[PDB]
Amino acid sequence: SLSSKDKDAVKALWGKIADKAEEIGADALGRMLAVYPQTKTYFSHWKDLSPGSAPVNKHGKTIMGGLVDAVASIDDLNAGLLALSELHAFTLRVDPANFKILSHCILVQLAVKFPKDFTPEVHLSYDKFFSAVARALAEKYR
Amino acid sequence: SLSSKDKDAVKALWGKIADKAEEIGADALGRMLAVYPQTKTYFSHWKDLSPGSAPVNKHGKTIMGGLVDAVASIDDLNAGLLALSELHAFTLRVDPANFKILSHCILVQLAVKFPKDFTPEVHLSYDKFFSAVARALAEKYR
Amino acid sequence: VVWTDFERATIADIFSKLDYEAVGGATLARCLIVYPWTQRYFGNFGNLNAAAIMGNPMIAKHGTTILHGLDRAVKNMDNIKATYAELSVLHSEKLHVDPDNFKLLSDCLTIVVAAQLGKAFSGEVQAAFQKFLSVVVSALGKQYH
Amino acid sequence: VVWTDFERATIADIFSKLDYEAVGGATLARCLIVYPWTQRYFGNFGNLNAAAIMGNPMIAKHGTTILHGLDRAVKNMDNIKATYAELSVLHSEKLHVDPDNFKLLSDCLTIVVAAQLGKAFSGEVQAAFQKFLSVVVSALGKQYH
Ligand code: HEM
Ligand code: HEM
Ligand code: HEM
Ligand code: HEM
């Protein structure tokens, strides 16, 4: 469970990154595909997996929108992400081992641009948030 | 989240095992210590780690009563297991990676004694249960 | 790995008691039911509901193949890494199976074996069994060395 | 492991830019704060509170030791398993460190390095760094072969 402290810390990061959000989504997704190429099997439609390819760009926007939604729904992530959980379980069948990988890539992408926001105690708040997001997305698997 | 079907399955198993519960906890603990010796560091005060020694017998009873509490709190494991979580986090300081190990050894132990209860669908419920218990015990770590 | 006389005899003794078709089929079905995301890796084995998974013949066939695959390590105890060199390439470079999944399947196998062998599957027996599965899953995962 | 020229250049390049005392100290403190159960493996290191961890001289020292340990692999990229043979024994048979923790520590180091290097830590660069850490973590875990 996220404390009030964690929630404030997460929402404030999210406000801070707003301007650069679509860039962040595109680059993090680029990182996941190149750094953890096991994830490529889910996106074999896209010929160009470079960040700045139109499809990586467009889907990066979508992931960040999903995360903005999670932020809006931070008090009950399970309820707030039920549709997306269902989608990742049954329409796609994403291996939930992969959720942690995306999370790490978002954190890394953010650290390259906003390094001052990455004090250990804030990173602790962000990691709890992404861990709860992953758990919420995993809810509908079984 | 456990379904009402999962909760029924777990309650039904828990009823079936009552006469053998203390021996189930002792053996499961014995299996943990021998099969996954990284766990011995938490109990290096026991001279005899065999499932028939008095320390292991008495502590298997304690584990099983913790799990009986979890059955009674099955509607909200997170709230029901809060003190046990804080204990495992701060007094005993247990790497929460070990919870899944003990869950597994309990399931193995149960399988050897009650093999007819291990239909695929029952096993699925029991695993969801043990995973939820471990997630609840993990709550107060951070 | 270095095997003790006890470990060596215990592993061969366990497998001498298994119907590879019965155990392999029950094991793969168990994994696909208890951990349903693992179904993704098998998207061309037809229909995968619990009754459908249970009656699925290709699932039965492939569970059998896995057990014979494990039997191969039983027959090559001191050379498991080389024995699994091609299988490791297959399961990583070609299939991209997350290694967590090997542990999930191993755990299902252990519980299926436990249920069959009953009281004979003692802690000391399980220990030897788990050592073997640890060596196998290590040889099946991506090889960095 | 077959390293590309880009990969070898990038790994040496990264480590040549890291102050081992600063980065190591920061990485270890980060792990003990973000994943606080990891503290149990250092129960003989004194006062551990985030500010206490940040100020602890033993943690600063042990963080430096980890970076020097990684340097051994940077200086021996084709022979990491052998180089880490005693470290692997130490962290398993002696310290019984659950292997997930190697990943936790590796991810902290990656975030520490990404914050330092900024725009320079591109996807391509992180890809090479992570291959390196995967080989290192595989070599540090219990060896079954
Ligand atoms: C932080 C975790 C994640 C979030 C918030 C997230 C969010 C989203 C959203 C909002 C969509 C679009 C749904 C729609 O259009 O209705 C989506 C689609 C998708 N997601 Fe995720 N996702 C996450 C993790 C993952 C991971 C880890 C993978 C695989 C490695 C994955 C694979 C996919 C695929 C294949 C699609 C369909 C994309 C397409 O059709 O091009 N997702 N996700
Ligand atoms: C199913 C999960 C678990 C449950 C339900 C559980 C339950 C309990 C309970 C109820 C106690 C109180 C002991 C007493 O009052 O005498 C306890 C203590 C303890 N637990 Fe757990 N536990 C679990 C998992 C673990 C694991 C995985 C480990 C370590 C590998 C662990 C290590 C300990 C230790 C060291 C104590 C103190 C034992 C002693 O006082 O001698 N526990 N546990
Ligand atoms: C104890 C661990 C395992 C062993 C010993 C094993 C063994 C085998 C063997 C012998 C084959 C046939 C290879 C060939 O056709 O040349 C195979 C194929 C395959 N395995 Fe595994 N396997 C294991 C675990 C897994 C896991 C966990 C998964 C996925 C969750 C998996 C997915 C597959 C798939 C998708 C194929 C190809 C199926 C086909 O095309 O017919 N395996 N495995
Ligand atoms: C990249 C991963 C790691 C590397 C390269 C590494 C390297 C080292 C080195 C070089 C030593 C000193 C051994 C000696 O005295 O010769 C050491 C000791 C130690 N390591 Fe690690 N380590 C790693 C991960 C971890 C993790 C994740 C933990 C705990 C969860 C851990 C716990 C310890 C402990 C408790 C010692 C003993 C420290 C002492 O008392 O001097 N290590 N490690």
| In chain D, domain spans | 1-145
What's the CA gap between D23 and A37, in Å, rounded? 28
**C142 within 8 A of C92, measured Cβ to Cβ:** yes
Q: Which residues of B touch C (CB under 8 A)?
A: 27, 30-31, 33-36, 51, 104, 107-108, 111-113, 115, 118, 120-121, 123-124, 127
**Method in brief:** X-ray
Distance spanning both ends of chain C, measured CA to CA: 15
Sign of CA dihedral B94, A77, A23, A55: positive
What's the CA gap between B111 and B117, in Å, rounded? 8
Tell the residue nearest (CA) to atom 20 of ligand 2. B88
D residues 70..109 contacting A (CB < 8 A): 107
Q: Residue A123: its chain B contacts at CB < 8 A?
A: none
Atom of ligand 4 lying closest to residue D70 CA:
5
Please state, as a whole number, how many other Cβ atoms lie within 10 Å of the Cβ of residue B8: 12
- Secondary structure of chain C in the HEC alphabet? CCCCHHHHHHHHHHHHCCCHHHHHHHHHHHHHHHCHHHHHHHCCCCCCCHHHHHCCHHHHHHHHHHHHHHHHHHCCHHHHHHHCHHHHHHHHHHCCCCCHHHHHHHHHHHHHHHHHHHHHCCHHHHHHHHHHHHHHHHHHCCCCC
Q: Which ligand is nearest to the CA of C102?
A: 3
Distances in Å between the Cα of B30 and the Cα atoms of A11, B99, C8 are: 46, 15, 22
Residue among B1, B124, B139 whose CB faces A1 most closely: B139
Residue among B30, B112, B121 whose CB faces C118 most closely: B112
**From the CA atom positions of chain C, what is the Rg in Å?**
15
What's the CA gap between B53 and B63, in Å, rounded? 15
Residue corresponding to tokens 């650069």: A20
- Under 8 Å CB-to-CB from C122, ≥6 apart: which residues? none
Say whether B122 sits in a helix, a strand or coil.
helix
Regarding the beta carbon of A129 and ligand 1, being less than 6 Å apart is answered no
What's the CA gap between B59 and B65, in Å, rounded? 10
Regarding the beta carbon of A138 and ligand 1, being less than 6 Å apart is answered no
The candidate with the shortest Cα–Cα distance to D130, out of D116, D101, D109, is: D109
B1-142 CATH choice from 1.10.490.10, 1.20.1250.20, 3.30.70.1380, 3.40.50.150: 1.10.490.10
Q: Return the amino acid letter for B126.
A: Y
Q: How far is D37 from chain B (nearest CA, A)?
A: 6
The angstrom resolution of this structure is 1.9
Please state, as a whole number, how many other Cβ atoms lie within 10 Å of the Cβ of residue A14: 19
Atom of ligand 3 lying closest to residue C105 CA:
27
Q: Residue D101: its chain B contacts at CB < 8 A?
A: 95, 97
Q: Residue D138: its chain C contacts at CB < 8 A?
A: 144-145
What's the CA gap between B124 and B122, in Å, rounded? 5
Regarding the beta carbon of D136 and ligand 4, being less than 6 Å apart is answered yes
Q: Residue A112: its chain D contacts at CB < 8 A?
A: 114-115, 117-119, 121
Nearest CA in chain C to D1: C144
- Per CATH, the homologous superfamily of domain C1-145 is Globins (1.10.490.10)
Burial class (CB in 10 A: 0-12, 13-18, 19+), B131: middle
**D1 within 8 A of D135, measured Cβ to Cβ:** yes
**How many angstroms is it from D102 CA to the middle of ligand 4?**
10
